[PDB]
Design a protein around this motif. Structure first.
Motif, PDB file in Angstrom:
ATOM      1  N   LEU B  21     -24.063  58.859 -77.581  1.00 18.25           N
ATOM      2  CA  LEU B  21     -24.084  60.136 -76.847  1.00 18.25           C
ATOM      3  C   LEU B  21     -23.058  60.993 -77.480  1.00 18.25           C
ATOM      4  O   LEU B  21     -21.964  60.529 -77.667  1.00 18.25           O
ATOM      5  CB  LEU B  21     -23.643  59.911 -75.407  1.00 18.25           C
ATOM      6  CG  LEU B  21     -24.704  59.822 -74.332  1.00 18.25           C
ATOM      7  CD1 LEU B  21     -24.017  59.609 -73.036  1.00 18.25           C
ATOM      8  CD2 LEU B  21     -25.488  61.103 -74.299  1.00 18.25           C
ATOM      9  N   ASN B  22     -23.372  62.227 -77.809  1.00 24.29           N
ATOM     10  CA  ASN B  22     -22.416  63.036 -78.529  1.00 24.29           C
ATOM     11  C   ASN B  22     -21.736  64.089 -77.669  1.00 24.29           C
ATOM     12  O   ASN B  22     -22.304  65.167 -77.413  1.00 24.29           O
ATOM     13  CB  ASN B  22     -23.054  63.669 -79.756  1.00 24.29           C
ATOM     14  CG  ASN B  22     -22.085  64.546 -80.530  1.00 24.29           C
ATOM     15  OD1 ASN B  22     -21.169  65.130 -79.956  1.00 24.29           O
ATOM     16  ND2 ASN B  22     -22.282  64.644 -81.839  1.00 24.29           N
ATOM     17  N   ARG B  23     -20.505  63.791 -77.258  1.00 19.32           N
ATOM     18  CA  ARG B  23     -19.756  64.667 -76.363  1.00 19.32           C
ATOM     19  C   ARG B  23     -19.405  66.038 -76.964  1.00 19.32           C
ATOM     20  O   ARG B  23     -19.385  67.022 -76.260  1.00 19.32           O
ATOM     21  CB  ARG B  23     -18.516  63.940 -75.835  1.00 19.32           C
ATOM     22  CG  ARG B  23     -18.825  62.508 -75.329  1.00 19.32           C
ATOM     23  CD  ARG B  23     -17.698  61.855 -74.512  1.00 19.32           C
ATOM     24  NE  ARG B  23     -16.646  61.324 -75.381  1.00 19.32           N
ATOM     25  CZ  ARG B  23     -15.349  61.270 -75.050  1.00 19.32           C
ATOM     26  NH1 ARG B  23     -14.940  61.713 -73.849  1.00 19.32           N
ATOM     27  NH2 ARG B  23     -14.458  60.786 -75.926  1.00 19.32           N
ATOM     28  N   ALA B  24     -19.138  66.117 -78.261  1.00 26.34           N
ATOM     29  CA  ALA B  24     -18.855  67.414 -78.876  1.00 26.34           C
ATOM     30  C   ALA B  24     -19.993  68.385 -78.657  1.00 26.34           C
ATOM     31  O   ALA B  24     -19.775  69.566 -78.383  1.00 26.34           O
ATOM     32  CB  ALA B  24     -18.619  67.260 -80.355  1.00 26.34           C
ATOM     33  N   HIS B  25     -21.213  67.872 -78.822  1.00 21.12           N
ATOM     34  CA  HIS B  25     -22.447  68.648 -78.709  1.00 21.12           C
ATOM     35  C   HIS B  25     -22.670  69.050 -77.261  1.00 21.12           C
ATOM     36  O   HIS B  25     -22.914  70.232 -76.975  1.00 21.12           O
ATOM     37  CB  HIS B  25     -23.622  67.826 -79.219  1.00 21.12           C
ATOM     38  CG  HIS B  25     -23.755  67.822 -80.713  1.00 21.12           C
ATOM     39  ND1 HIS B  25     -22.737  67.425 -81.554  1.00 21.12           N
ATOM     40  CD2 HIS B  25     -24.792  68.166 -81.516  1.00 21.12           C
ATOM     41  CE1 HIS B  25     -23.134  67.532 -82.810  1.00 21.12           C
ATOM     42  NE2 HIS B  25     -24.379  67.978 -82.813  1.00 21.12           N
ATOM     43  N   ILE B  26     -22.562  68.071 -76.352  1.00 20.82           N
ATOM     44  CA  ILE B  26     -22.805  68.315 -74.932  1.00 20.82           C
ATOM     45  C   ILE B  26     -21.854  69.370 -74.435  1.00 20.82           C
ATOM     46  O   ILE B  26     -22.293  70.431 -74.033  1.00 20.82           O
ATOM     47  CB  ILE B  26     -22.748  67.047 -74.049  1.00 20.82           C
ATOM     48  CG1 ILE B  26     -23.897  66.112 -74.406  1.00 20.82           C
ATOM     49  CG2 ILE B  26     -22.889  67.427 -72.605  1.00 20.82           C
ATOM     50  CD1 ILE B  26     -23.741  64.703 -73.953  1.00 20.82           C
ATOM     51  N   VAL B  27     -20.558  69.101 -74.485  1.00 20.96           N
ATOM     52  CA  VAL B  27     -19.572  70.152 -74.200  1.00 20.96           C
ATOM     53  C   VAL B  27     -19.936  71.534 -74.802  1.00 20.96           C
ATOM     54  O   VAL B  27     -19.801  72.544 -74.121  1.00 20.96           O
ATOM     55  CB  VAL B  27     -18.091  69.717 -74.507  1.00 20.96           C
ATOM     56  CG1 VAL B  27     -17.746  69.894 -75.925  1.00 20.96           C
ATOM     57  CG2 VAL B  27     -17.133  70.521 -73.699  1.00 20.96           C
TER      58      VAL B  27
END
Lengths: 246, 246
Positions: B21-27
């Motif tokens: 899961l990519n938090r940089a992208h989600i944020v």
């Protein structure tokens, strides 16, 4: 050796009878759950508090007495409830898997067997399931849900024991708050014996103890705040009201 | 003034096409959602990734191809997925309310109206609903769910726009990876016009665009990684394939 045990936590155990979720108390319970998990036992959590938690987190807002208000509270509360359980267990490096079930979902026989399978898959892979009524979607108010849901979970999960953690020591011969007479009833043998012995949410507990003992599963009403309660119940140390299995 | 918009995020947008899961992208997405929330718009999130997330968190274990394996993955993944969304939004001090719905729950007319009410109660009280297929309980595999679920949510939530964030720029005249010819189809007018214009999960998107445009709701296929995408879609700036409403 390796027991399976379902632990039910009602709202007052979780808030310690306040209107805020009480993390000191919960962690105290998680702890006992971890010690047993580490001994290779299997643990299932049936958690209340979704709405309590949603009121807290939203700063106790004023809302219409719609179904939609219980539901949005439940939507917000569960997102927190889960996170909370996820993090406390995570401390002892145990994973959790969130199951939200409706009263409906359970009477649907196919979904019933599904759930059995999944519960066991969870435990098999060392995960603690954390189950709750799916209140953001559940059409039907409260009302002792949960007590019943937990006794279903006990069956599906192949439980050896069902532990109903409440805000009093067990089951009494009459209301203890207004009574110097009231005994704590140490043992009970199926519901009919209970109802004879006694002639606050206590009926639905009597109800869950039925469904579960009739399914071969011992069930206990005990204080959620009692030190060492959960382990003691595994060892069959006497701790509250024990409803023996048929 | 105050628009309502449903944003759907499929697995690849969420993992940035990885298996974590990519938090940089989600944020990056949450951010855009907050800017619009702060402008007093109403935002609904339909999130995938529950299983991806469960595999990650359990360290990609080897499991039987049962339904019970998709489900336990989903139990673990959703507990994380939600937490993640809860925390990122929490940064901008926006609350979230978790809704897990089954394909079943939606055809049951009473539960359908319930959900409408609750979605609106949520938005009314400034909360972002974060909806997903209830995969730990859902009997039926995958399969484009989710695209359809999102278009239902658009209707129930009284959406002005439905935004289907995917891993390509929109809809093409043919497969663009194996084609120097492929145009990005800027506009489409209802499904029949789509299917004429074109003679990877792209069918169920064509499907959701139908259900939603037929319900009066514009729907857009666009790259989830495109900077400023969500705001641009509010302002009706051209950004991908726009499926106009009937």
């Amino acid at each position: 050796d390796s027991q399976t045990l379902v632990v039910k936590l009602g709202t007052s155990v979780l808030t310690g009878g306040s209107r805020r979720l009480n993390r000191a108390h919960i962690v105290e319970l998680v702890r006992q759950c971890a010690q047993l998990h580490a001994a290779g036992h299997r643990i299932v959590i049936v958690t209340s508090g979704a709405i309590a938690a949603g009121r807290e987190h939203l700063g106790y807002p004023e809302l219409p007495a719609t179904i939609a208000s219980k539901q949005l509270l439940a939507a917000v509360g569960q997102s927190r409830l889960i996170q909370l359980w996820e993090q406390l267990f995570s401390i002892y490096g145990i994973h959790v898997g969130q199951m939200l079930l409706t009263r409906a979902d359970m009477e649907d026989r196919e979904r019933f067997l599904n759930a059995r399978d999944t519960l066991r898959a969870l435990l098999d892979n060392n995960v603690v399931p954390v189950i709750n009524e799916n209140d953001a979607v559940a059409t039907a108010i409260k009302v002792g849900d949960n007590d019943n849901l937990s006794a279903l979970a006990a069956i599906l999960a192949g439980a050896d024991k069902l532990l109903l953690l409440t805000d009093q020591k067990g089951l009494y011969t009459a209301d203890p708050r207004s009574n110097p007479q009231a005994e704590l009833i140490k043992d009970v043998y199926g519901i009919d014996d209970a109802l004879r012995a006694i002639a606050g949410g206590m009926s639905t507990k009597l109800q869950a103890a039925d469904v579960a003992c009739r399914a071969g599963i011992d069930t206990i009403i005990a204080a959620g705040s009692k030190p060492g309660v959960i382990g003691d119940v595994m060892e069959g140390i006497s701790v509250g009201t024990l409803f023996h299995a048929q």
